[PDB]
Structure formats: structure tokens, C-alpha cells
Write an enzyme that holds these catalytic residues in place. Structure first.
Site, PDB file in Angstrom:
ATOM      1  N   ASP A   1       0.885  -1.144   0.000  1.00  0.00           N
ATOM      2  CA  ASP A   1       0.000   0.000   0.000  1.00  0.00           C
ATOM      3  C   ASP A   1       0.931   1.204   0.000  1.00  0.00           C
ATOM      4  O   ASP A   1       2.134   1.067   0.225  1.00  0.00           O
ATOM      5  CB  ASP A   1      -0.863   0.017   1.259  1.00  0.00           C
ATOM      6  CG  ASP A   1      -2.215   0.689   1.043  1.00  0.00           C
ATOM      7  OD1 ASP A   1      -2.292   1.859   0.318  1.00  0.00           O
ATOM      8  OD2 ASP A   1      -3.209   0.139   1.557  1.00  0.00           O
TER       9      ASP A   1
ATOM     10  N   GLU B   1     -10.205   7.018   4.558  1.00  0.00           N
ATOM     11  CA  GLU B   1      -9.181   6.510   5.457  1.00  0.00           C
ATOM     12  C   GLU B   1      -9.233   7.188   6.830  1.00  0.00           C
ATOM     13  O   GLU B   1     -10.315   7.431   7.360  1.00  0.00           O
ATOM     14  CB  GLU B   1      -7.797   6.657   4.799  1.00  0.00           C
ATOM     15  CG  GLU B   1      -7.675   5.832   3.505  1.00  0.00           C
ATOM     16  CD  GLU B   1      -6.327   5.956   2.807  1.00  0.00           C
ATOM     17  OE1 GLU B   1      -5.292   5.701   3.463  1.00  0.00           O
ATOM     18  OE2 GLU B   1      -6.307   6.291   1.597  1.00  0.00           O
TER      19      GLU B   1
HETATM   20  C1  LIG Z   1      -3.337   2.879   0.127  1.00  0.00           C
HETATM   21  O1  LIG Z   1      -3.231   3.393  -1.239  1.00  0.00           O
HETATM   22  C2  LIG Z   1      -3.801   2.514  -2.247  1.00  0.00           C
HETATM   23  C3  LIG Z   1      -3.595   3.187  -3.639  1.00  0.00           C
HETATM   24  O2  LIG Z   1      -4.005   4.549  -3.610  1.00  0.00           O
HETATM   25  C4  LIG Z   1      -5.294   2.248  -1.878  1.00  0.00           C
HETATM   26  O3  LIG Z   1      -5.850   1.369  -2.856  1.00  0.00           O
HETATM   27  C5  LIG Z   1      -5.361   1.628  -0.476  1.00  0.00           C
HETATM   28  O4  LIG Z   1      -6.721   1.374  -0.115  1.00  0.00           O
HETATM   29  C6  LIG Z   1      -4.757   2.644   0.515  1.00  0.00           C
HETATM   30  F1  LIG Z   1      -4.797   2.141   1.820  1.00  0.00           F
END
Ligand SMILES: *[C@H]1O[C@H](CO)[C@@H](O)[C@H](O)[C@H]1F
Ligand SMILES: *[C@@H]1O[C@H](CO)[C@@H](O[C@@H]2O[C@H](CO)[C@@H](O[C@@H]3O[C@H](CO[C@H]4O[C@H](CO)[C@@H](O)[C@H](O)[C@@H]4O[C@@H]4O[C@H](CO)[C@@H](O)[C@H](O)[C@H]4NC(C)=O)[C@@H](O)[C@H](O)[C@@H]3O)[C@H](O)[C@H]2NC(C)=O)[C@H](O[C@H]2O[C@@H](C)[C@@H](O)[C@@H](O)[C@@H]2O)[C@H]1NC(C)=O
Ligand SMILES: *[C@@H]1O[C@H](CO)[C@@H](O[C@@H]2O[C@H](CO)[C@@H](O[C@@H]3O[C@H](CO)[C@@H](O)[C@H](O)[C@@H]3O)[C@H](O)[C@H]2NC(C)=O)[C@H](O)[C@H]1NC(C)=O
Ligand SMILES: *[C@@H]1O[C@H](CO)[C@@H](O)[C@H](O)[C@H]1NC(C)=O
Length: 602
Positions: A285, A491
Site C-alpha cells: 500500500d 481513510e
Molecule cells: C493505500 O493506497 C492505495 C492506492 O491509492 C489504496 O488502494 C489503499 O486502499 C490505501 F490504503
């Protein structure tokens, strides 16, 4: 002489082996790097042999860009990569989690929680199909979806990205995968990656694992639970993804019993790869490995070692690619990370690219541009929105005449609320911007617009964002539709401990409802304190985060279709009851999971 990997008529495994066997360390580590478009250059891509690019929330060519503009951008990056010695096409990823949501004009579908209320996996599958087309319409070939987390605490800012608190429901919704990638052949081996072709996209099951189980719903936090519950609640859906050929899997920022997922070799390699027999590639991530340590990035060297040895194949850097490549190279040169680890990672990335036909169709198809925002897709979204609505109340007393469906023909009606005419609010997080936005940020129909588009020519429709009691009592309205709710969030910005909607909200509902019979539409990404709103309303509908097609809301309000949606989560009486899920010990819900009043089309 003859080059096997460039021959499209050869088996995928042979092409992977053939190519892998010609790659230099630099080219191998390059395939493992995914960088943000914001730091990409033809040179950067070519010189560093970058294997993939992504567009983070809001990362776009320019506001309001067209599908052609996206196609040109992606193609531009691709040409650079195609110009390398081996000419390995890059795979561009993006967060198309409820449509091609970063893109202006893209059809915005209801967020997951709402889709869970529909209990219609086929509908979700159809949504995945419409989504792939709209992503390809912009030349992108990889979507970071579906998020198959099982949100167990509504306080989690990402709960709306969860179909349900009931793994069984989340498992059933993995049908989005075959929608996005296409159906796997009947012979198909569970664990292998799959993508039908250039008109489909690679999917991503995220976030491995237990992301929906952090304490107090604190995002990216620790999930305290035995392997019994981990495997009983948060793991199931992944096994389904394996059977449906999910191409990739993204690791969660969260931890499990104190261990960062991005560093858990037992789960990522021991279980996901060795036990579940996953053959696609594991991606990280955004700065996921940086966050292994604390402070984050306070030992990037360790981050690379832990993550790679843990089993991750592709790292979403996504900016300091130089640091990442330099460090990973050093570790390999020093023997700290064996070439077998690198070879395995590259084997998986190439397998996915070959399988999806990337080497055959590295570039965007102009003919696909029209797919973006195609009316049919919007009609589909409209249907999903309607089906996701959960009627919680439809009459103040057992003897009251049911308010819904409302009549399309009335002398004068009131439409009010902060959310009655706000397309951004109605779409919530992951829409145009990363955190979502307020106002008319894209193409769609607000609740107010949908109302005007539904009522009889004679019905006068008045709009007042926040009318006071007197205004309503003097307006001579037959009834009122008031929409209120949460604001867009994503988030951690979405973590909430009090879970009460911002004002004006309740006040507007109380003011409006005090004056005339009202139908309150609640826009939220999760259940929220609702007794006060309930007390004042004649009828109250939980619309979650509908998307761009608001007519989905009026389709039910006016009786063109009857309400069918059922709560995909537990509605609590108070936040201090949390956590509290179905099958729990002290299960004392305001509305139990599965609850939902119905109506029949007029
Ligand atoms: C972290 O970033 C990615 C790409 O932007 C997302 O798909 C995840 O859900 C996020 F936690
Ligand atoms: C329950 O707990 C949550 C947080 O855990 C709290 O909501 C959060 O409150 C934070 C401050 O206490 C707030 O952070 C600040 O945000 C300021 C800007 O906030 C506006 O813009 C963002 C987007 O950019 C929205 O997400 C916000 O909702 C807010 O939006 C405006 O809200 C008003 C009021 O409804 C509305 O009239 C405007 O039209 C609307 N405009 C927009 C942009 O749409 C910023 O300047 C500060 O520096 C600081 O960062 C945080 O954003 C918010 N979380 C979210 C996503 O809502 C709950 O309620 C509080 O809400 C805030 C907005 C305010 O009304 C407080 O009085 C509320 O308590 C908490 N509930 C309770 C009962 O405490
Ligand atoms: C889960 O979330 C909690 C937060 O509720 C994490 O614990 C918290 O950790 C932070 C830092 O990691 C602590 O805050 C302060 O950070 C600054 C950084 O410069 C430091 O100087 C201070 O001394 C302090 O550490 C905070 O005190 C701490 N709070 C708690 C809950 O005890 C926790 O680490 C997260 N769990 C994981 C591993 O995801
Ligand atoms: C009314 O709706 C219920 C549930 O939504 C459904 O079972 C029933 O068949 C419908 N009635 C008619 C006459 O269609």
C-alpha cells in the site's frame, strides 16, 4: 534468434521463464517498482526499467480531463517503458473502487456498504463489468478493488468500503472480481491470476488481512484477535478471490497481534502464497513498508528487507523510487535478499502481465473512450442506488398512513437539507479528489434534480437548504424530502468516535418535519446516531453513499420501485456499545442486521 517471450502463441509460463532468464538485476528490481505518475518521466521510466505506475487519490492529468487525455497520458508512459531493451510494458493502477471515481465524468456507483444492502451479487458483478470498461476507457488496466475487508467497528473511516460486518455477505460480493477481470474458464485452478483481455482489468483484493478488525476502528491500527477469528472472519473472502482468479492482492497497513502485515512472512508467504496457493502478485500500500517502522520511514533499509523477505512482490513506493531501488539493490548485492526472492516476485508480476495480454495490447484503445459515463452504466448505477436504500421507518405510528411512496402529483412540495442538492456529499470519499469533495464535482443528478425530474408538471418544487419552522409551516407544502448526513471522508480522516452527523442536520429535519410530514434521506457511509432523526421523521431512508445517480433515490421515494434493501450492518443504539456485531454476546441493536421495511411499486 527466435525470442520466446515475445511470441504471443506460447504458454504464459514459458513466456515468463524465457523473459525472466534474460533480465539483469536492475531490470528485475525495476519490475518490482510502482511509482506515482507525479514523479514519472520517460527517462525515469526507461532508465529505471519501472514495471508499474499508479495514480493515487486525486492524481489526475488535469481537472476535468477527458478519457482521451487519460489515454494519452498512459500511452505516453507506456511508450517510454516499451522503449527499454526488453520492452516490458508497464501496468498502470488506480483506485476505481466505485466506478472510475478519480476520472471526471465517470459513472459513480454506490459505495460498498450500500451494495451490501442490496444482497445482489450479480448486480455487483455487473457493476464490476461497467467499471472495467470505464477504466479501460481511460487506458488504465488495473483497478485496486475490491476491498474485501470485514468492517467490525463503524468508527473505522473505511467502513463504507466494506460490504458488511458479516463475512458471508462480503464473500458473496467477490463477484465484482469476475466482473472486473471476466469469468475464469471452467478448468481454472484456484490461486492463478486471470484477466479476459484488453476490455477487462486486473483486480486487487485488499487489504490483506483483517483491516476491518482494528481496535475502536482506528485505521491502520492493530487487530487483536486469535488466528481462529482471523481465519473465521477476515480470511474467508480471500479464499473466494483465489477461486475467482483475483490477479493481485494488496497488503494492509494494519497489524495482527502487534505484527505489521507488510512484514508478516507467515501470512503473506506462509499462508497466502503457500497455503492459499496464490499465483498472482502481492503489492504494497502507499508507503506501506515505510510504516512498518515507527516513526514511519525511520529505517527504510529495514523496511525494504522486512517487506520483500515477507513476500511482497511489487512495492508502491510511490515517490522515492531512487531510494527504494538503491537499497533493494544493495541488499541483493550483499546477499541479504536471495535472488530467488527477487525471481519469485518478478515471476508473479510477469505472469499477471502476460496473462492479461499486456504484451499484446500495451496501449489504450480510442474506441473505448465513449465507455466513460455511458448512459447504460449510469442506469446500472441508478438501479444499484435504488436497491441499496434501506427504509428504517415509514410512519410515526402503527396506525399512521405510510408516507412512502410519495405522490408525484402535489400542489407544492419542499426539498431541503444540506445533502438535498450536493453531488459531492452524495458520492462521499474516493470521488474526483482523494477525500471526496463538496458541490458539483462531476456529472450526475442530485436528489433535488432527481425530484424535479420525477414530479408531475403541475407539482411546484421549492428548494431551501435550511428553512426554519415558520418557512415550512407557511409554505403550503404537501410533504417534504429532507436530505442530511456525513461529509465526504477517506481513510483516517474518516475515523470517528462519536459517530453523530454534523449540523445543521438534525435541526433542519426537526424544523422541516415539525411543519409538514417529511421523508428524511440519510446520507452516510455507516450507521450513525439516528434516534433523534428517527423521532422527528415520518419516514426515514438510509441511502448510504448513493453515487452520482440520485434518481436511484427518487425511484423508491415515489414508488416506481419498492424498497428492498436490508441493513448490511448492525445499527447501534449508542457508540459505547461498540464493537457489537451480529452473533455477539450482548447483541442489543437499535436495528439488527438484515432489517429493512419494504414497499411495493405504485
Ligand atoms: C493505500 O493506497 C492505495 C492506492 O491509492 C489504496 O488502494 C489503499 O486502499 C490505501 F490504503
Ligand atoms: C465526531 O468526531 C469527528 C472527528 O473525529 C468530528 O468531525 C471532525 O471535526 C474536526 C474538528 O473537530 C474536523 O477537522 C477540522 O476540519 C476543518 C474543516 O472541516 C470542514 O471541511 C472538511 C473537508 O475539508 C469536512 O470534512 C468537514 O466536515 C467540514 O466541512 C464543513 O462542515 C460544516 C459543518 O457541517 C458545513 O457547514 C460546511 O458546508 C462543510 N464544508 C465542506 C468542506 O464540505 C478544518 O478547518 C480544521 O483545521 C480541522 O481539520 C474534521 O474535518 C471533522 N471530520 C469530518 C470528516 O467531518 C465530529 O463533528 C465535528 O464536525 C466539525 C466539522 C464541527 O462541526 C464540529 O463542531 C463537530 O463536532 C464529531 N462530533 C462531535 C459531536 O463532536
Ligand atoms: C495504534 O494506534 C495507536 C494510537 O492510538 C498507536 O499508539 C500511539 O503511537 C504514537 C506514535 O506511534 C504515540 O504518539 C506520540 O508519537 C510521537 C512521535 O514523534 C512521540 O514523540 C511521542 O512520544 C508519542 O509516542 C502515542 O503515544 C501512542 N498512543 C497509544 C495508543 O498508546 C499504536 O502504535 C498503533 N498500533 C499499531 C502498531 O498500529
Ligand atoms: C411487495 O414487496 C415484497 C417485498 O419487497 C414482495 O415480497 C412482494 O411480492 C411485493 N408484492 C407485490 C404484489 O409485488
Amino acid at each position: 534468434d527466435y525470442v520466446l517471450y515475445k511470441d504471443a502463441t506460447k504458454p504464459v509460463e514459458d513466456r515468463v521463464a524465457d523473459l525472466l532468464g534474460r533480465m539483469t538485476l536492475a531490470e528485475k528490481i525495476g519490475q518490482m517498482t510502482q511509482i506515482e505518475r507525479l514523479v514519472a518521466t520517460p527517462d525515469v521510466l526507461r532508465d529505471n526499467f519501472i514495471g508499474s505506475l499508479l495514480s493515487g487519490g486525486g492524481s489526475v492529468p488535469r481537472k476535468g480531463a477527458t478519457a482521451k487525455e487519460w489515454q494519452d497520458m498512459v500511452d505516453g508512459f507506456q511508450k517510454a517503458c516499451m522503449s527499454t531493451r526488453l520492452g516490458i510494458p508497464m501496468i498502470y493502477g488506480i483506485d476505481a473502487v466505485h466506478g472510475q471515481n478519480n476520472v471526471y465524468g465517470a459513472t459513480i456507483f454506490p459505495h460498498n456498504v450500500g451494495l451490501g444492502a442490496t444482497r445482489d451479487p450479480y448486480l455487483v458483478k455487473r457493476i464490476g463489468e461497467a467499471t472495467a470498461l470505464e477504466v479501460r476507457a481511460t487506458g488504465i488496466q488495473y483497478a485496486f478493488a475490491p476491498c474485501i475487508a470485514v468492517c467490525r467497528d463503524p468508527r473505522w473511516g473505511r467502513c463504507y468500503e466494506s460490504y458488511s460486518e458479516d463475512r458471508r455477505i462480503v464473500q458473496s460480493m467477490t463477484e465484482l472480481i469476475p466482473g472486473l477481470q471476466g469469468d475464469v474458464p471452467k478448468d481454472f485452478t484456484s490461486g492463478m491470476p486471470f484477466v479476459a483481455g484488453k476490455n477487462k482489468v486486473a483486480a486487487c483484493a485488499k487489504h490483506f488481512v483483517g483491516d476491518g478488525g482494528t481496535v475502536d476502528g482506528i485505521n491502520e491500527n492493530n487487530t487483536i484477535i486469535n488466528r481462529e477469528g482471523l481465519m473465521n472472519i477476515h480470511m474467508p473472502a480471500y479464499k473466494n478471490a483465489m477461486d475467482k482468479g483475483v490477479s493481485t492482492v494488496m497488503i494492509s497497513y494494519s497489524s495482527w497481534n502487534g505484527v505489521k502485515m507488510h512484514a508478516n512472512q507467515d501470512l503473506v508467504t506462509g499462508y497466502l502464497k503457500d497455503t492459499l496457493k496464490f499465483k498472482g502478485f502481492v503489492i504494497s500500500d502507499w508507503e506501506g513498508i515505510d510504516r512498518i517502522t515507527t516513526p514511519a520511514g525511520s529505517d527504510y533499509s529495514y523496511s525494504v528487507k522486512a517487506s520483500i523477505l515477507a513476500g511482497l512482490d511489487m512495492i508502491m513506493v510511490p515517490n522515492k523510487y531512487q531510494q527504494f531501488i538503491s537499497i533493494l539493490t544493495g541488499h541483493v548485492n550483499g546477499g541479504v535478499i536471495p535472488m530467488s526472492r527477487i525471481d519469485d516476485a518478478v515471476t508473479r508480476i510477469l505472469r499477471v502481465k502476460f496473462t492479461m495480454g499486456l504484451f499484446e495490447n500495451p496501449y489504450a484503445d480510442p474506441a473505448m473512450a465513449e465507455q466513460l459515463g455511458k448512459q447504460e452504466h449510469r442506469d446500472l448505477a441508478r438501479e444499484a442506488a435504488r436497491k441499496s436504500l434501506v427504509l428504517l421507518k415509514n410512519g410515526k405510528t402503527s396506525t399512521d398512513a405510510p408516507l412512502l411512496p410519495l405522490p408525484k402529483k402535489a400542489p407544492k412540495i419542499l426539498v431541503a437539507g444540506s445533502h438535498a442538492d450536493n453531488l459531492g456529499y452524495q458520492c462521499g470519499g474516493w470521488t474526483i479528489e482523494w477525500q471526496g469533495d463538496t458541490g458539483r464535482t462531476t456529472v450526475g443528478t442530485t436528489i433535488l434534480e432527481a425530484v424535479k425530474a420525477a414530479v408531475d408538471p403541475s407539482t411546484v418544487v421549492v428548494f431551501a437548504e435550511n428553512p426554519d419552522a415558520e418557512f415550512v409551516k407557511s409554505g403550503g407544502f404537501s410533504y417534504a424530502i429532507v436530505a442530511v448526513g456525513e461529509h465526504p471522508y477517506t481513510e483516517t480522516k474518516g475515523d470517528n468516535l462519536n459517530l453523530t452527523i454534523p449540523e445543521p442536520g438534525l435541526s433542519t429535519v426537526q424544523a422541516v418535519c415539525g411543519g409538514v410530514r417529511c421523508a428524511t434521506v440519510l446520507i452516510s457511509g455507516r450507521p450513525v446516531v439516528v434516534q433523534p432523526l428517527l423521532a422527528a421523521s415520518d419516514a426515514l431512508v438510509a441511502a448510504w453513499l448513493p453515487g452520482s445517480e440520485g434518481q436511484g433515490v427518487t425511484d423508491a421515494l415515489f414508488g416506481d420501485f419498492g424498497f428492498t434493501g436490508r441493513l448490511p450492518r448492525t445499527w447501534f443504539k449508542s457508540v459505547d456499545q461498540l464493537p457489537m456485531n451480529v452473533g455477539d454476546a450482548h447483541y442489543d441493536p437499535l436495528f439488527r442486521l438484515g432489517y429493512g421495511l419494504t414497499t411495493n411499486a405504485t
